[PDB]
Write an enzyme that holds these catalytic residues in place. Sequence first.
Site, PDB file in Angstrom:
ATOM      1  N   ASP A 127       0.870  -1.214   0.000  1.00 13.93           N
ATOM      2  CA  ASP A 127       0.000   0.000   0.000  1.00 13.93           C
ATOM      3  C   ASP A 127       0.899   1.254   0.000  1.00 13.93           C
ATOM      4  O   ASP A 127       1.784   1.342  -0.845  1.00 13.93           O
ATOM      5  CB  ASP A 127      -0.969  -0.122   1.222  1.00 13.93           C
ATOM      6  CG  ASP A 127      -2.036   0.959   1.275  1.00 13.93           C
ATOM      7  OD1 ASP A 127      -3.108   0.797   0.619  1.00 13.93           O
ATOM      8  OD2 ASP A 127      -1.835   1.960   2.017  1.00 13.93           O
ATOM      9  N   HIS A 177      -7.148  -6.874   0.188  1.00  8.17           N
ATOM     10  CA  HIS A 177      -5.974  -5.935   0.192  1.00  8.17           C
ATOM     11  C   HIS A 177      -4.826  -6.301   1.093  1.00  8.17           C
ATOM     12  O   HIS A 177      -3.650  -6.024   0.747  1.00  8.17           O
ATOM     13  CB  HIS A 177      -6.509  -4.544   0.491  1.00  8.17           C
ATOM     14  CG  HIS A 177      -5.493  -3.439   0.552  1.00  8.17           C
ATOM     15  ND1 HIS A 177      -4.791  -2.970  -0.546  1.00  8.17           N
ATOM     16  CD2 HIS A 177      -5.061  -2.714   1.626  1.00  8.17           C
ATOM     17  CE1 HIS A 177      -4.013  -1.958  -0.152  1.00  8.17           C
ATOM     18  NE2 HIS A 177      -4.160  -1.794   1.157  1.00  8.17           N
TER      19      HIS A 177
END
Length: 291
Positions: free
Chosen positions: A104, A270
């Site tokens: 991320d 994610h």
Amino acid sequence: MFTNFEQTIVDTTEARINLVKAGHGAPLLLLHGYPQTHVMWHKIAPLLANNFTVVATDLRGYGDSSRPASVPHHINYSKRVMAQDQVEVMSKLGYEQFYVVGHDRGARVAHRLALDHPHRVKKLALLDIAPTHKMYRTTDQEFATAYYHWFFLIQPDNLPETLIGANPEYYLRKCLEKWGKDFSAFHPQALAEYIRCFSQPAVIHATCEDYRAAATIDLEHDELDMKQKISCPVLVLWGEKGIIGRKYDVLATWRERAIDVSGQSLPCGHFLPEEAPEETYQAIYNFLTHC
């Protein structure tokens, strides 16, 4: 968590960077994302520390690292500056070349780190991202909806700081729920740590600044070396259950920015190192060990 890791705070030229470190072997820098801290690596860092010297830091603005206040054009949360802190940490620790794995925001830091310090980054792994420039430049309804925080968190006049600051834990939890596909994946002690750090108003502000920089100064930087490609081997891993791999051709996005790209989807959302720790570790291990 991180049993037998050393915790330290390294003072660099512009920032104090909190970290945990363990292992022997070739140096490996792990860089977390939003709204998390180095604690996201807790399932896989100990496995990695069986074969590498693992260094898991908090990015500036995050965790227990320094969080300077905003400047004009968000220059001090540019990925260039954020990556420079990390280079200095690894130098202070005796490593002038090393492997990097980012997730991320950490991946975005890592990408710029590799471009700015091509001699230092020997191998690069990027978890659950497409490049920032591609993501903004290809904005459409579906992206802006799924990634609405790329528009919300960059609003001016302290709008997100105020709305988040009213109840930071609520907001954090909503983010984790939306982007992840197994809330069980989050160890209660890990959740407590994320909440502790993100509840501090200086961190709420600084992390919004990171997003602000990504919409502005980072895109200037990326455009000013778009012809340069990452030179070292690059691994890209993403979550199959998330929108990222449905909407985008993840490896194709990275082949525009790097000469040597491989990778694959993993069976999660994610938060790869928390949702799919064994598969994430295996992939990283093979990439770093067999080339």
